[PDB]
């Protein structure tokens, strides 16, 4: 006998990925503000999505940590604020907005000296489990022009958005960099689907280049020849 | 109050590390976990479900991919001739490519377990003859002809009585030749008037239950 | 036995490892298929041939399973086959006349990976030639003998298993090596299992008799030999 | 009676030795690009190839500590990241490589001010164990000339490697160098070998100076002096 | 929500401490360790295992270096000439340095125990004659002659009956002369026609179960 | 002498840790509850009514 435990969910899961990276400089059109609001997907990590996308239906909780740093690599005392915005919650348009100090959405106070922020998402759809396929529409009416755009979208699977911040009220110091990672927890998956063969060419939609179309293996010259 | 040591390895943090963490939301109790059908709980629930094996391997006509999944087998032939041929490692490129447990390989390193190919005849009712598949086991070529074919392990495979044939690869491990599956004309492919030259064989392919996979590793499809 | 020539067998037996030979039991063997135990026809009694020992020579060694790898039966049931497993007892037998000395080391070293001389200063990244790493039948003489060719001190060698040939005492070894590997199941021409090692310590001298070369005769026979792929 | 406890294998090789010195200069043709690629071997800390070709066989774990400073031995405020890179996954060929966002390779991300990042690698052999020896070939085929390089090399001893970073996106402000250190655990070894008496030439291949033989031990003038 | 207060020593990280750390690779089984013969537990096993002594010392043959593991006993001696004589300390150079025993301890600095010596003679089976072994304790000088070597503890070896004997040493620990180990000419070296007028002697040396080393040191070969 | 190591998140304070922390008034007694009518226990008491 051998172990069939790393062919398990978790064991093909769990393991923090680097989801996102926000660039806070201090000159540049990049993030000019002051602030960044990263909405959350299983994205980012690219090489996540055809692993998700095995399953049609799944259901996890989510561990994020926060490693910050200067392009050098360099820490510098900075207090920044990772801001947790739940789904229908109203994220912040401004750097003074009031949204910061709504305390209905989480908030982290995180010394840069400090060792990476943790903190973990629980399940957040409507639905008894998170879907990646929705073959239709979510609202209950109209047919006219481009609702197409709309086809295929699951709102249901928000988690939410991460907000960070310096913090104010003047800007910083430092040029700062936040790199959010990204862990699953408790997997569980359903509906089996055929594992990915085209390159992706959307996010939340999973049209393909209809004209470059690239099989699925690697060819040979012939079905007699090695 | 209470004596502790800072041992080394503090105030790291390791991508993988299997730790608790503060909950964002205490109080927040999530939707409820109904039933849904078809929940898989391990990857080799998966390797163990046959799946189409492109065999014959044309890339350049991109307009006609389909014709991946299918063997040729025509009248013109003759005794002996060699139909197909493919190497018996699924987590290698690229007949198995095709192959959901050969795919799953991909984002995985190491592995061992037996392999079983099901063959499915597609041609006419009326139509009849009988082929050879032969394996060849690592080290060693392809046998040089069908007498040489019979030496080794083999099936005689008629359309007379079995439409469907599967072949059990016995073992193949990942200690990095790779083995040989052949398929031969035991016959000439026997057919009445107004019946098809020519008809076509789907391969199939899964893992048995004593399949198993060993280390993560992730693959090459891009996003954006 | 197909011809047993009685030697009075005696405690010149030696296990390999307190491991006698055994067939790999298929819990521990990983295969699923049934694996081809060979009957007798393969474990008769192959002896190599006779070595001529003389004051001047160094030593000999072979490679098992390299010996026999072209040599009969077993040669042709292991080229053919893909994988493996097997056990030997080596019988080396050296007559020699009441008036002879000399003293033999017959000894068994797993992996004996040889290293050749890479120039006398260091000047090669070189790597020993296909004849010397694997000699088979006809065997090969050592170069250098108090390292082992291998930077190794042969003065520590008996740590492995060993059998002492005092002319004055004895002139035969016996030694019976189990399968020792880290896989159950290996190639037979690409990885050679152990080495047969067999050096004149204490060397032969006379005052000129009527034989100036004592033989060397070493008959072997495989104990629990064990193959899978076929062709 | 006494105690054998000291004379067992693991009160024998138990403990962390330096294995790795790795130099990360700002200029300098050491390193130019700002990463490492270090594969892991037991050596460096030379005097372990003769305690561990000692025995033919081997097993255990492995305990990697990093301890991390400048030349002067100075510890300044950077942000260091260790990536481990197991076998057969796909080292990194340059700075930007994705090989350091691919989630299958473990990484450590310690700040240079944080104490000495620690972790453990287990036994990664797909064999039942380690050799230090392989007396043959580990292909399956071919004959010719110069195939002799590959003589006595065994590949599945390889345990991974690991990479150090800065981190990105700019050079370090920083002179750093990152010791290595390696610990042997659950320590199983198997056929016991005569041990090396000569200098050794080469890794991986134990040929020696054929004309420069050096015998084992001391010498002295004669039999029946002391 | 729990007081802990910081020792003195966090943070501090020492070559030696057996700490646990975080696994690199959680839900990685490794291969399962198959039975594999002579497994050794423990370095005494091998400090019991008897190994050639190299007593006699001559390294100008580089060319003959295999001359080192043999005495020379021939017909041309006499009565009480001193055939050879080493010392009863391994981890000390020299002649014990070609042993397994000699070149353990060197990886050790304090030890104890009990060792023996087992002699060989190798010559004609037609050659006799007897020679004395003695051993001579720490403190106290090599003896004068044969007769002063008796007092002391000494074996009659014959090479009538008995081609091989073993010396055993009562003790010997590291709390820091040796001891001293002589052989002798009892008698000539007695030959008949055709047989050879000289021979030569292996010496085989180890320590018997009571043999314990107590601390851990480290040696001298180069790597590259 | 008790081997213990940091884990990422220590220092953070999060506005919604539900921890306990030193009390500024020990032994300070507050003024006992006495039974008054009317207590909710629920918000949907109230989406009730």
Same mark, same amino acid.
């Given at each position: 006998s051998h172990?069939? %435990? =790393?062919?398990?969910?978790? *064991?093909?899961? *769990? #393991? %923090?990925?680097?989801?996102? =990276?926000?660039d806070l400089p201090l000159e540049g059109t990049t993030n000019p503000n002051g602030y960044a609001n990263w909405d959350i997907d299983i994205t980012g990590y690219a090489q996540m999505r055809r692993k998700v996308e095995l399953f049609t239906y799944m259901r996890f909780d989510a561990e994020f940590t926060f490693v910050a740093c200067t392009p050098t690599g360099e820490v510098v005392p900075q207090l920044l604020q990772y801001m947790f915005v739940p789904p229908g919650a109203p994220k912040p348009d401004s750097r003074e907005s009031l949204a910061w100090q709504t305390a209905t959405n989480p908030s982290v106070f995180v010394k840069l000296s400090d060792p990476p922020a943790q903190v973990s998402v629980p399940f957040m759809s409507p639905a008894s489990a998170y879907q990646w396929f929705y073959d239709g529409y979510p609202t209950f009416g109209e047919h006219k022009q481009e609702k197409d755009l709309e086809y295929g979208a699951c709102p249901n699977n928000m988690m939410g958005t991460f907000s960070v911040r310096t913090v104010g009220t003047s800007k910083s110091k430092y040029?700062?960099?936040?790199?959010?990672?990204?862990?699953?927890?408790?997997? #569980? %998956?359903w509906i089996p689907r055929p594992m990915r063969n085209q390159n992706y060419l959307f996010k939340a939609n999973p049209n393909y280049a209809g004209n470059s179309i690239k099989p699925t293996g690697a060819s040979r010259t012939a079905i007699t020849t090695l | 109050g209470f004596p502790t040591e800072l041992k080394p390895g503090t105030n790291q943090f390791l991508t993988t590390d299997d730790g608790v963490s503060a909950p964002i939301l205490p109080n927040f109790h999530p939707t409820p976990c109904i039933h849904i059908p078809g929940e898989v709980r391990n990857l080799l629930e998966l390797c163990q479900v046959e799946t189409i094996l492109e065999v014959n391997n044309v890339p350049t006509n991109a307009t006609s991919l389909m014709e991946r999944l299918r063997f040729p087998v025509s009248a013109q032939a003759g005794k002996g001739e060699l139909c197909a041929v493919f190497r018996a490692d699924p987590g290698r490129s690229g007949p198995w490519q095709s192959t959901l447990l050969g795919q799953l390989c991909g984002y995985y390193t190491q592995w061992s377990g037996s392999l079983e190919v099901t063959f499915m005849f597609t041609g006419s009712?009326? &139509?009849?003859?009988?082929?050879?598949? &032969?394996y060849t086991p690592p080290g060693g070529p392809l046998p040089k002809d069908r007498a040489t074919a019979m030496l080794g392990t083999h099936v005689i495979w008629d359309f007379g009585l079995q439409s469907s044939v599967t072949l059990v690869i016995p073992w193949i491990s990942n200690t990095h030749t790779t083995g040989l599956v052949s398929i031969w004309y035991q016959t000439n492919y026997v057919v009445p008037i107004g019946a098809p030259n020519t008809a076509y064989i789907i391969a199939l392919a899964a893992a048995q239950k004593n399949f198993t996979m060993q280390l993560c590793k992730d693959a090459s499809d891009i996003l954006q | 036995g197909n011809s047993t020539i009685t030697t009075q067998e005696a405690a010149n037996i030696i296990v390999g490892y307190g491991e006698w030979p055994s067939y790999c039991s298929d819990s521990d063997a990983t295969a699923v298929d049934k694996p081809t135990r060979p009957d007798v026809s393969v474990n008769r009694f192959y002896t190599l041939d006779t070595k001529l020992w003389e004051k001047s020579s160094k030593g000999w060694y072979w490679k098992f399973p390299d010996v026999l790898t072209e040599t009969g039966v077993f040669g042709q049931n292991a080229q053919f086959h893909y994988l493996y497993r097997s056990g030997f007892c080596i019988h080396v037998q050296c007559n020699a006349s009441k008036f002879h000395q000399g003293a033999l080391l017959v000894a068994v070293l797993p992996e004996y990976v040889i290293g050749t001389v890479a120039g006398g200063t260091g000047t090669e990244d070189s790597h020993p030639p296909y004849k010397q790493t694997q000699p088979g039948a006809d065997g090969f003489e050592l170069q250098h003998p108090y390292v082992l060719d291998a930077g190794i001190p042969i003065s520590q060698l008996t740590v492995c298993p060993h059998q002492w040939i005092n002319l004055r005492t004895n002139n035969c070894a016996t030694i019976i090596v189990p399968y020792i590997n880290a896989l159950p199941f290996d190639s037979a021409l690409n990885h050679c299992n152990f080495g047969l090692l067999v050096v004149p310590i204490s060397p032969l001298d006379y005052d000129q008799g009527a034989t100036p070369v004592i033989p060397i005769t070493i008959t072997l026979a495989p104990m629990c030999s064990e193959f899978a792929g076929l062709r």
């Open positions: 172990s069939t %435990a =790393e062919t398990t969910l978790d *064991s093909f899961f *769990s #393991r %923090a990925g680097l989801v996102g =990276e926000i040029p700062l960099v936040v790199r959010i990672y990204m862990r699953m927890k408790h997997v #569980r %998956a | 009712f009326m &139509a009849t003859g009988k082929m050879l598949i &032969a | -």
